[PDB]
Symmetry: D2
């Protein structure tokens, strides 16, 4: 019978495309979401119409807190409830906004959201995934620009760097269990909805390969590769999917 | 008048050596400590005997929490209270222990300690340092083995990777203010008290340059360079002080 | 209308497995070789027996010299001669042996180790670009480039130079629609000269399975990078090392 | 008696500042040069007028060829002939110009000059230095922008990458002899004489720390640090001296 995947933040944009591609590949999927219930439920509806009871939704805040470990355990539990197994975890959900060092949300809340979503929740989901255990693997959505970071995005950038460390540490630790742990690192893919079109076009013009952003599907293609049998010896690797952007000097 | 430095976790081991060498160079120093009050007071005594009114202690827990931003603000305030200025911040304090992914602190506590000390506290101290602002700089104590991490040290490794990101992000953002941000990355220096002698000797035998761990003073020498007028164009750099250890394959 | 690929050092081992997988995917192939003529011709025969007129051999020494640019140009020319096009270049051929700092002269060691691992890939890349669909180059790198084998300075310098080429060429050739990427094995097929005991020592260091990668596993990554599933990927080096590079001393 | 250093390409610019600063620190120096004979001799005259018998000159082409190994042996031998010892080797000499992949010097000459000066000569000098052998070390002049390379500078970038490899491989291999091997990686320092003023200003404006290039002396300061007793545990490290330039995204 069919393998099962959890994709965090799967209601929209890149997470949605990953969930859809995994589903087209034969996976049953847990569509995790936070606020986007309509989009999550609509996606599960689309996938279940394609193949009955091959998709479920699971809501959780992945901000760091006292209850985050239980929340992450329940996400993995929801995959076993629905499908009796959990083969693939994709850590995609991510808060992304500036946190300037020099002078809305308190800074402790910004820490909670940015470090929780990008690092701590992936760590806790990774714990719960492994504890509950074939071709088992984890794919972490990293960032090709982590060493050339956006100005005033220190907490975001810290969370993504921590995610590289988790990818490597978990690859090493989980290898004895046959669980591979890899990353996919977009440069610019779907640009933020709140970005103006002038600013979007400025980023596009920087990308060497085609002067355009990656589609969500091009990002998902790398995830599909990493979870496949064609990546059976790949662990601890982070594949940039950035059209050369990270190679361009200032 | 004499510049001033804050050193976190300065009561013992590497931080103590750092504080000592800063003081020998002419700095006034805030000796931050958490639990090691006797060692901290004793160090301030020794330094004030050498030059009166040039050392104070400052107690703070650097575990993550909603009041960590206030604690970090108060550490920087304590330097201004004692000395009227704060020229150098050294982020040295660090929790270090295993957190296995599979199999009596709660995981919430482990996250708070390891990510708070190694990453979030450095970030909040950097914010407070900058907000309060000559040769101004910050030095982060990193880890040369961050990409070849110890088995079952995921959270620690996550915090140290996050600290690399902070070093880079803050270097970029604080450059306009004339604040340099750099790192020093030991391999093995003073080995942990709790580590057994056999295990210490196994690590020693791995170091190409001398088959021995670094002294705390050797680590301090790199901090002294980075804060000095000889490093005036250096920002965002992490200097390994590892005797070649990170170059050795499995 | 089938695309064509040049694979350097393709007569045996990993280059053979790459050539075979590319052929199985639908490519016509130039099997470049240096000394392994019998193995090269035998491979071309297997492939042509599957699909007529889809494989040719091409001999060349890739040691650095003043005629190396001509040799590299001729390898690319040989793909256009046989197939009328050249879509994919795989830089796989490589000399590998120690060159301690303290029979071959040092001049020869530089020529072979830097030639095969870095300069020939550069010249092949120049000739490939000059003669120009889903065009790409794949360089065979080394996951252990930053934790090098003792006394392999020149080999390691060549593999580091190859990373630089991968990045430099990705940048410069992107406007031509040519993608340039790498595949970095840790331990795969161990050297023929290596003793079984020494092999086992290396196998035991690999976190994922305590074994070396198959040639096919390496080839799989090459196939991904040349495919339409990697159309936005350029300047990326994919480790295929079972976690080996993550293991401390 | 006084230790002795070889500095390649020491007649002008950064190499000259390095030789001067080593000499000021107390070293006797071999000034290697290729075409800049008048400047080389003028420097030797200046240094010797300062302290007698502390500077000599050695001419050689460092282009790759069948005779380069002998030329490199002779450079090292010049230090022994004059001073009876050779404590420090600085690999500074470097060809730097574009070599476009798609369409003066033939390409084989470009390869010889760019890979020879930046990689092969450093390797052969290192062999010669080690074979002839206290605080012994080698410092290689690297490039902070090696991973965000100048368009159409493939062979130069290849040579600098190879030099990183040499730095690491030689640090590992020479550690048992007590020879440290490290690098210094400028971003922009003294800009090329042939670069137009407008283009120079364009580079300066990209540097976060001060919006200007590094003086040669600032580069030399990091060299002095690495050769000093304050760097006794440091080997295989490359210190960026780039004002944050390499952290700046496109
Ligand atoms: N877009 C790019 O160009 C780009 C570039 C580099 C890296 N990446 C990485 O690729 C991944 C996908 O990027 P994206 O642009 O598709 O992401 P996104 O739209 O910014 O965020 C994806 C989802 O994250 C979830 N999320 C945010 N905060 C959360 C919280 N506190 N708790 C739980 N879930 C939360 C949201 O779920 P709801 O909508 O349900 O609230 C959101 O839809 C991210 O990890 C990102 O860092 C993207
Ligand atoms: N030792 C090595 O070989 C090595 C290797 C790589 C990197 N480093 C890095 O170099 C730095 C110094 O190393 P080290 O061995 O000297 O460190 P350490 O002895 O392990 O820790 C230094 C100090 O950190 C403080 N600390 C721990 N938890 C804290 C908390 N919750 N709040 C506030 N302070 C806390 C402690 O202060 P109190 O004693 O006052 O409680 C402790 O004395 C660290 O950042 C470390 O990770 C060291
Ligand atoms: N094997 C591994 O574990 C491993 C690990 C890390 C990286 N890699 C990389 O993966 C690639 C394949 O590895 P491999 O073990 O299959 O390679 P290999 O068997 O050591 O060498 C491959 C071929 O290179 C060709 N070659 C050597 N010197 C040459 C010269 N002067 N001119 C032209 N061709 C020459 C030879 O062709 P003839 O036989 O026709 O003379 C040889 O068959 C290499 O780039 C290697 O560095 C391999
Ligand atoms: N300038 C920068 O911003 C910058 C940036 C990044 C890295 N770096 C690195 O820092 C070092 C010094 O930079 P720089 O700008 O001072 O160097 P440079 O002026 O470009 O060159 C230094 C010297 O290299 C020697 N040289 C060139 N080709 C040679 C050959 N074939 N044989 C022997 N020697 C040769 C020349 O000696 P003669 O004059 O005697 O002929 C020249 O004076 C170089 O390694 C460079 O790559 C510099
Ligand atoms: C454009 C971008 C870079 N990194 C990102 N991370 C998240 N979560 N969302 C985004 O839109 C982006
Ligand atoms: C041995 C070691 C590596 N990293 C460390 N970090 C801290 N805080 N304390 C330590 O003792 C170590
Ligand atoms: C084991 C190995 C690592 N790197 C290699 N490069 C070549 N060419 N051949 C080999 O056998 C290896
Ligand atoms: C500006 C620059 C970057 N890298 C360089 N290398 C050499 N040799 N000379 C230069 O002028 C530069």
């Amino acid at each position: 019978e069919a393998p099962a995947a959890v994709v965090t933040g799967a209601a929209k944009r890149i997470g949605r495309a990953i969930a859809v591609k995994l589903h087209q590949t034969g996976y049953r999927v847990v569509i995790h979401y936070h606020n986007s219930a309509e989009a999550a439920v609509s996606l599960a509806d689309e996938l279940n119409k394609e193949r009955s009871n091959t998709a479920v939704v699971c809501q959780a805040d992945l901000t760091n807190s006292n209850v985050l470990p239980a929340s992450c355990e329940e996400i993995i539990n929801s995959c076993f409830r629905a499908f009796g197994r959990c083969d693939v975890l994709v850590n995609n959900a991510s808060a992304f906004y500036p946190t300037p060092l020099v002078q809305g949300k308190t800074v402790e809340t910004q820490v909670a959201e940015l470090i929780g979503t990008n690092a701590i929740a992936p760590f806790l989901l990774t714990m719960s995934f492994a504890q509950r255990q074939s071709n088992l693997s984890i794919v972490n959505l990293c960032d090709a620009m982590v060493d050339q970071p956006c100005m005033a995005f220190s907490l975001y950038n810290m969370g993504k760097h921590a995610l590289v460390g988790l990818t490597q540490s978990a690859a090493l630790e989980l290898a004895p269990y046959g669980i591979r742990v890899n990353g996919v690192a977009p440069g610019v893919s779907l640009l933020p909805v709140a970005m103006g079109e002038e600013e979007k076009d400025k980023w596009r013009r920087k990308v060497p390969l085609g002067r355009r952003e990656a589609s969500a599907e091009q990002i998902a293609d790398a995830v599909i590769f990493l979870v496949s049998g064609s990546a059976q010896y790949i662990t601890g690797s982070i594949i940039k999917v950035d059209g050369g952007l990270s190679l361009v000097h200032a």
